[PDB]
Amino acid sequence: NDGVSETLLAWRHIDFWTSEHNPDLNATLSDPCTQNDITHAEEDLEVSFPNPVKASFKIHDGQETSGLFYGFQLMTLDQVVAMTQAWRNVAKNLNKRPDQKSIPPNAVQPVYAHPAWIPLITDNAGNHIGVDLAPGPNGKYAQIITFGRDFDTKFVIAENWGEFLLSFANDLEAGNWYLVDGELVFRDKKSNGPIQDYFEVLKRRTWIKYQLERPHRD
Amino acid sequence: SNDGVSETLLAWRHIDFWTSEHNPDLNATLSDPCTQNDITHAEEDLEVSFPNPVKASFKIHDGQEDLETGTSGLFYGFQLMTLDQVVAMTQAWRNVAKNLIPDQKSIPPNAVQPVYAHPAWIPLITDNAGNHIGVDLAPGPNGKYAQIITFGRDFDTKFVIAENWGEFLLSFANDLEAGNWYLVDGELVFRDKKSNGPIQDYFEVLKRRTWIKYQLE
């Protein structure tokens, strides 16, 4: 019940999909990490990666570069370590010295940077999707969040990495894509909709899901 | 390796020896160890992984209790909680957090989440009045995982009082060894010996020490 199953299922689809519809993108999916690579990374960052994340890394060590997630790049373990230390530097500088918010409220710490936010995806422009290993009081450990330069408001986009990868997989399978050989971008197929930034899609989905759930209290 | 396990083992030696010499009645309240099963069961209940030094401490004493008044707590009146009490109280605070009180703050700033209650604040000590010392498994951006904090009903401002449970237990041990106490075998209370200090609430001592340490660190 950690999301490992989803991680594996998701990668099957994503692997098969890219090979069929975008071999060029498939070609960028790296070989697995070894357990040593992971132990080394865990020791460097003084952190324990969630099971589904470890699972994902043992399938592909990121990408080697048009990014897989509708333009956003799956980070290599080395990139994860480098960027995590980058964010850790930011958090220290901030210690000494734009309202930070969270959807759902109190799910994610209301801060610009946290040492326990491990980035796994990048827009190569300062923004990330990653795992939250230090949730707010109404958050969940190893929930998947957006954070970064332009993420003054953070979003919980999935309960775990597995469910994130799967919802991406389901978008591919549902035909919610346009090619621009080309660059992969999101469009909602059922609505006959325009091209949209995938972060905007994830944000709207989080926002909607939050709202449909508010009624329930118990 | 650098988690405070050493310090936990060392501390409990000085604390076991001290109580036996200066307050056998208090020594008598220190429970037998937990088994690994007790701990695994607790970890499974709370869906949480206890830090190493905490596990170590539990495998020396499962808190304190006595049938015979109420329990005179080890930490200058504050009671070391049994694993059962830890599980029960953690679930109690988890209920509070779900149901959710002035501005919540942290010393050092941003070391502790600025909230009244968090599911990952595991209480280990109680004043039996709503307040705790415990482990923070979800620190703020300038905090440290498994740092030791004050929280509870009267702790709108939270304090990081140690880097880990080991260092906490040891600094308590050092207070005992420095003669910073007074018996009222009666009830154990804090006083600073080296200066001829008054009787003080131990929470007030820890708060002042944290505040001072924060300044010119």
| B137 three-state secondary structure | coil
Q: For residues B93 and B120, give the distance between their C-alpha atoms in angstroms, rounded to a whole number.
A: 10
User: Locate tokens 């060392």: which residue?
Assistant: B10
For chain B, where are the alpha helices, taking DSSP H only? 5-22, 24-27, 36-46, 52-58, 83-99, 165-177, 202-214
What one-letter code names the amino acid at A1?
A: N
Q: For residues A135 and B138, give the distance between their C-alpha atoms in angstroms, rounded to a whole number.
A: 7
What one-letter code names the amino acid at B73?
A: G
Alpha-carbon gap: B118 to the closest alpha carbon of chain A (Å): 5
Chain A hits for B139, CB-CB cut-off 8 Å, are 116, 134
Tokens of B65: 């209790």
Q: For residues B126 and B132, give the distance between their C-alpha atoms in angstroms, rounded to a whole number.
A: 5
Q: For residues A198 and B178, give the distance between their C-alpha atoms in angstroms, rounded to a whole number.
A: 62
Alpha-carbon gap: B62 to the closest alpha carbon of chain A (Å): 27
What number of CA atoms fall less than 13 Å from residue B74's CA on the CB side? 28
φ, ψ at A177 (rounded to 5°): -155, 155
Q: For residues A158 and A7, give the distance between their C-alpha atoms in angstroms, rounded to a whole number.
A: 12
Domain limits for position B133 = 1-217
Question: How would you classify the pairing of strands B188-191 and B182-183?
Answer: antiparallel
Question: How would you classify the pairing of strands B157-162 and B105-107?
Answer: parallel
φ, ψ at A66 (rounded to 5°): -60, 125
Tokens of A28: 């960028």
Q: For residues A214 and A192, give the distance between their C-alpha atoms in angstroms, rounded to a whole number.
A: 29
What number of CA atoms fall less than 13 Å from residue B4's CA on the CB side? 25
Residues B202, B76: contact at Cβ < 8 Å? yes
Nearest to B160 by CA among B103, B113, B97, B92: B113
Chain B hits for A116, CB-CB cut-off 8 Å, are 139, 145
How many domains are contained in chain A?
Answer: 1
Question: How would you classify the pairing of strands B188-191 and A101-103?
Answer: unpaired
3-state secondary structure chain A: CCCHHHHHHHHHHHHHHHHHHCHHHHCCECCCCCHHHHHHHHHHHCCCCCHHHHHHHCCCCCECCCECECEEEECCHHHHHHHHHHHHHHHHHHHHCCCCEEECCCCCCCCCCCCCEEEEEECCCCEEEEEECCCCCCCCCCEEEEEECCCCEEEEEECCHHHHHHHHHHHHHCCCCEECCCCEEEECCCCCCCEECHHHHHHHHHHHHHHHHCCCCC
Q: For residues B145 and B3, give the distance between their C-alpha atoms in angstroms, rounded to a whole number.
A: 10
Residues B141, A114: contact at Cβ < 8 Å? yes
| B156 three-state secondary structure | coil
Residues of B with CB under 8 A from a CB of A: 97, 100, 109-110, 113, 115, 117-120, 138-142, 145
Instruction: Provide CB contacts within 8 A for A100, sequence distance 6+.
Output: A110, A111, A112, A152, A153, A154
Selected for mutation to probe chain B from A47, A96, A138, A160 (highest B CB count within 10 Å) is A138
Edge-first strand order for the sheet with B131-136 is B79-80, B121-126, B131-136, B147-152, B157-162, B105-107
User: Locate tokens 């230090």: which residue?
Assistant: A134
Nearest to A145 by CA among A110, A178, A97: A110
Question: How would you classify the pairing of strands A178-179 and A153-158?
Answer: unpaired
Tell me which method was used to determine the 3D structure.
Answer: X-ray
In chain B, whose CA is at the least distance from the CA of A137? B118
Q: Resolution in angstroms for this experimental structure?
A: 2.5
Q: For residues B63 and A189, give the distance between their C-alpha atoms in angstroms, rounded to a whole number.
A: 60
Report in angstroms the alpha-carbon separations of A44 from A40, A50, B110, B136, B183.
Answer: 6, 16, 23, 22, 48
Report in angstroms the alpha-carbon separations of B13 from A84, A195, B7.
Answer: 40, 67, 10
Report in angstroms the alpha-carbon separations of B62 from A34, A208, B12, B44.
Answer: 40, 47, 12, 18
Question: How would you classify the pairing of strands A101-103 and A153-158?
Answer: parallel
Angle formed at CA A206 by CA A199 and CA B106, multiple of 5 degrees: 95
**Reduced DSSP (H G I as helix, E B as strand, rest coil) percent helix, strand, coil of chain B, to 5:** 40, 20, 40
Instruction: Provide CB contacts within 8 A for A206, sequence distance 6+.
Output: A103, A155, A156, A157
Q: For residues B148 and B168, give the distance between their C-alpha atoms in angstroms, rounded to a whole number.
A: 7
Instruction: Provide CB contacts within 8 A for A146, sequence distance 6+.
Output: A127, A128, A129, A154, A155, A157, A199, A202, A203
Nearest to A193 by CA among A175, A216, A208: A175
